[PDB]
């Protein structure tokens, strides 16, 4: 079984009806994941959750979005994706802005 360190890649926020922070993750064993918002652990609710694409056969890479539904200026801030497995840790952060702040 091919073992290798967890890795992540984060892309800038895109609007696709809902908002999406796109990402990729990889690793063997399959990594564990967590999101942070301004350094705080982000709990997934029906308005912010992780949504994956179905993975293609014969590949360990996983792609998806942090999907935000109906966000506002309060959701503007620093999003971090954390991944880990036994062979390494990875981390990536971007700034996202969804509405102008009053």
């Amino acid at each position: 079984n091919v073992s290798f360190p967890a890795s992540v890649q984060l892309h800038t926020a895109v609007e696709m009806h809902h908002w999406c922070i796109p990402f990729s993750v990889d690793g063997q064993p399959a990594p564990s994941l967590r999101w942070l918002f301004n350094g705080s652990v982000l709990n997934e609710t029906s308005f912010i959750f992780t949504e994956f694409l179905e993975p293609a056969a014969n590949e360990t890479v996983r792609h998806g979005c942090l999907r935000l539904n109906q966000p506002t200026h309060v959701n503007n801030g620093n999003y971090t994706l954390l991944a880990a497995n036994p062979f390494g840790q990875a981390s990536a952060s971007i700034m996202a802005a969804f509405m102008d702040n009053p």
Binding site: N38, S40, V41, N43, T45, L68, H73, V74
Partner: peptide
Amino acid sequence: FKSVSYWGFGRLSYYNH
């Protein structure tokens, strides 16, 4: 650590664990 949940409609609650 602290955590955050978004409940929609501009509602963010923080929770201090």
